[PDB]
């Protein structure tokens, strides 16, 4: 396989002073529930985490109502029951569809320039960008080489770089000429597929950005806490290092 | 060395603050996690519970006893006055903290037929044995030979307090919300 091209997106959580946009995360949760949840699942994400700080921060009662839409087999008695906030999201209903809990950390949207890793240093890992590119990477018409030879049950995706390719689109050296690859997932997004209450536009771009933000939150729900702890530690060590520098200078002035 | 001491001890203080900031998470990670703290109330069905039979359920990793006191248990529990009780407090979370350990204040209904209680000995946490055991027609903790009245009140042994009652209520005719 290899590294593809992902359209860089200015997400609200980029850079040291990055914070999840609460409304964007709520929209992402909505579009995940109404579209992605049909085939996907997030086994590592507690439902109760929807109420935690630094996330969607939904009210407790709303999260408890939301958790009731899932039918879960009880561990105590092995009988189906309504879901509770203490339960994680269901597993993937469709087998050939991975868990979306850590997808935003399990993919690197940025690669290169020549394996040195400099691109990721200045652009991050790019998992959310990869998800956004995958969701919006379905063109209307496939490549011209593949026409008449498309795999059955697969759809071309400009961002996917791990699927099969028709023999027509390959080259003499054996590498695929097409930038994309054939994924096993139909185009999930579509204009005005989800009705946002707050009136935010429901285009494929906006919806994909919202899903990517929500999946980033699901992957690392304590990103803002991590950044705050990092700043606190950096400042403690900065003050300590300046004081130690002055102490070392004063000490060595005696012998120098 | 005024400035010398000032600088050296300021460095020491900053180092101590950083050391404490690093040390506190090491202790704190052993406290209950968000998974444990998120545990909420459960619902127990008592539609098929007759007088004199106890039902033991699991809540917060501990046993909870729901007992339909018989007529004999009700009569015995109401006889004892506050004089001979080891501790006066009912220790019921569903009423005022200062209430006395009367049978009416130890039960979820005015007739004293129901008794929802923590099945955890207040001495060191063992599980008292039911079945009208002990010397007071109630429960008996065998770990250190403590006796609990028919209403769960401590009567003899090293236990310093009555068996606590958690938050509870009859949301339906035959359901109890524990927690």
């Amino acid at each position: 396989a290899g590294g593809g091209h992902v359209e860089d997106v200015p997400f609200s959580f980029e850079g040291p002073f990055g914070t999840f946009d609460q409304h964007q995360l709520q929209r992402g949760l909505q579009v995940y529930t109404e579209v992605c949840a049909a085939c996907h699942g997030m086994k590592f994400v507690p439902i109760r985490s929807l109420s935690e700080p630094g996330g969607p921060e939904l009210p407790e009662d709303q999260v408890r109502a939301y958790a009731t839409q899932f039918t879960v087999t009880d561990e105590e008695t092995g009988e189906d029951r309504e879901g509770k906030p203490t339960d994680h999201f269901p597993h993937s209903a469709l087998e050939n569809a991975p868990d979306l809990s850590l997808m935003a950390k399990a993919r690197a949207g940025f690669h290169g320039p020549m394996g040195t890793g400099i691109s990721q240093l200045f652009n991050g890992i790019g998992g959310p960008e990869y998800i956004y590119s995958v969701l919006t990477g379905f063109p209307e018409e496939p490549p011209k080489c593949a026409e008449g030879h498309e795999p059955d049950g697969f759809y071309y995706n400009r961002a996917f770089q791990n699927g099969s390719v028709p023999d027509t689109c390959k080259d003499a050296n054996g590498v695929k000429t097409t930038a994309g690859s054939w994924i096993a997932m139909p185009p999930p997004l579509m204009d005005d597929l989800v009705e946002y209450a707050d009136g935010h536009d429901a285009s494929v771009h906006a919806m994909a950005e919202d899903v990517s933000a929500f999946l980033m939150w699901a992957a690392e729900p304590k990103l803002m806490a991590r950044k705050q702890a990092g700043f606190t530690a950096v400042m403690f060590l900065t003050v300590l290092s300046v004081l130690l520098y002055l102490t070392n200078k004063r000490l060595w002035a005696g012998v120098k | 060395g005024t400035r010398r001491d000032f600088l050296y001890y300021a460095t020491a203080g900053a180092g101590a603050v950083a050391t404490g900031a690093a040390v506190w998470p090491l202790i704190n990670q052993m406290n209950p996690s968000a998974d444990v703290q998120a545990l909420a109330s459960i619902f127990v069905d008592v539609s098929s519970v007759e007088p004199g039979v106890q039902l033991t359920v699991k809540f917060l990793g501990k046993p909870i006893f729901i007992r339909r006191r018989t007529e004999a248990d009700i009569e015995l529990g109401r006889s004892v006055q506050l004089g001979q009780l080891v501790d006066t407090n009912a220790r019921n979370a569903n009423i005022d903290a200062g209430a006395e350990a009367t049978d009416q204040n130890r039960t979820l209904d005015e007739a004293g037929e129901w008794l929802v209680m923590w099945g955890v000995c207040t001495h060191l946490g063992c599980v008292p044995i039911g079945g009208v055991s002990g010397d007071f027609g109630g429960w008996f903790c065998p770990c250190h030979g403590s006796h609990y009245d028919s209403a769960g009140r401590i009567r003899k042994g090293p236990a310093p307090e009555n068996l606590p009652i958690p938050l509870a209520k009859f949301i339906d005719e035959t359901t109890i919300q524990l927690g």
């Binding site: 606190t232 003050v239 300590l240 | 400035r3 001491d5 000032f6 203080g13 101590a16 603050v17 950083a18």
Partner: peptide
Amino acid sequence: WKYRYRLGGFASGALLALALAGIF
């Protein structure tokens, strides 16, 4: 008063770390 700088220095150094660490 016998240990102004030994005592005041320690507290001042600690306060500067804590006071600044809460800036963010």
